[PDB]
């Protein structure tokens, strides 16, 4: 049910892309975004804690990424290296968590 | 830094194994264990929420697994099909999370 949608899916080099998030579970503690197809701390872009309303960069943050309170992710000034897969994890209040994988293509 | 240790590493069929967790981070929301080498909600054994002090089974829970408040995981009555990889994820309060993959061998 949890899914992502890239706006736009095909992104011109140097422009921006917004990863929209649909069907968020109801009771959430926070969000974590990753580069790639896997939840992997070594590739985490950002973590967002809902109660403190706080965004914290992970190792893959480049200074171009913004996360919003509804879990959408904005990436500015995209490069060819940003192309491909991104994985969102949402942390539910029972710690039985959910993932969704999105994608965009820079040309 | 976060590591697991199988106690014992070689486990006789039908006996039990305790996955000890070392180097846990200080500020945490909870823990999640998975069967396999990936964080994947479809293979989640258990989620443990520190604030409500509650364990919640995931799809891979079989009734044989117990998680402790220090994140250690006890699996009773192992079979040869249980051998291999298990993954712990620790959810930090800033949502910059950490993983460790452990392993044991059933003989
Ligand atoms: C994106 O690139 C433009 C043009 O170089 C620059 O003005 C802007 O600050 C950049 N944005 C970020 C977040 O670095
Ligand atoms: C999430 O919030 C952003 C920023 O306000 C907004 O642009 C976007 O439409 C929202 N997402 C959804 C699915 O409504
Ligand atoms: C975690 O708690 C369990 C149960 O009290 C204990 O057996 C185990 O030794 C603990 N793990 C560590 C690393 O202290």
Swiss-Prot record, chains A, B:
Residues annotated as region Required for homophilic binding?
Answer: 5-107
According to the entry, every stretch annotated as the Ig-like V-type domain falls at 1-107
Q: Which domain of life is it from?
A: Eukaryota
Q: Is-annotated flag, keyword Signal?
A: yes
Report the sequence similarity comment from the record: Belongs to the immunoglobulin superfamily. CEA family.
Question: Which GO molecular function terms does the record list?
Answer: actin binding; bile acid transmembrane transporter activity; calmodulin binding; filamin binding; identical protein binding; kinase binding; protein dimerization activity; protein homodimerization activity
Localisation per UniProt entry: Cell projection, Microvillus membrane; Apical cell membrane
Report the source organism. Answer: Homo sapiens (Human)
Its subunit composition reads:
Monomer. Oligomer. Heterodimer. Homodimer. Cis-dimer/oligomer (via Ig-like C2-type and/or via cytoplasmic domains); induced by trans-homophilic cell adhesion through an allosteric mechanism transmitted by the Ig-like V-type domain, and is regulated by intracellular calcium and calmodulin. Interacts (via cytoplasmic domain) with calmodulin in a calcium dependent manner; reduces homophilic cell adhesion through dissociation of dimer.
Q: Name one GO cellular component term.
A: lateral plasma membrane
Q: Does the keyword Secreted apply?
A: yes
What's the record's remark on domains? Ig-like V-type domain mediates trans-homophilic cell adhesion through homodimerization and this active process is regulated by tyrosine kinase, PTPN11 and PTPN6. Ig-like C2-type and/or cytoplasmic domains mediate cis-dimer/oligomer.
Could you say which tissues express the protein in this record? Expressed in columnar epithelial cells of the colon (at protein level). The predominant forms expressed by T cells are those containing a long cytoplasmic domain. Expressed in granulocytes and lymphocytes. Leukocytes only express isoforms 6 and isoform 1.
Starting at the broadest rank, the lineage of the source organism is: Eukaryota, Metazoa, Chordata, Craniata, Vertebrata
One GO BP annotation of this record = cell-cell adhesion via plasma-membrane adhesion molecules
* Chain positions with Pyrrolidone carboxylic acid modification: 1
Question: What is this protein's expression induced by?
Answer: Induced in primary T cells by activation with IL-2.
Provide the glycosylation site positions.
70, 77, 81
Q: Which UniProt keywords apply?
A: Cell junction, Cell membrane, Cell projection, Cytoplasmic vesicle, Disulfide bond, Glycoprotein, Immunoglobulin domain, Membrane, Phosphoprotein, Pyrrolidone carboxylic acid, Repeat, Secreted, Signal, Transmembrane, Transmembrane helix
Protein name, entry field: Cell adhesion molecule CEACAM1
This protein's encoding gene: CEACAM1
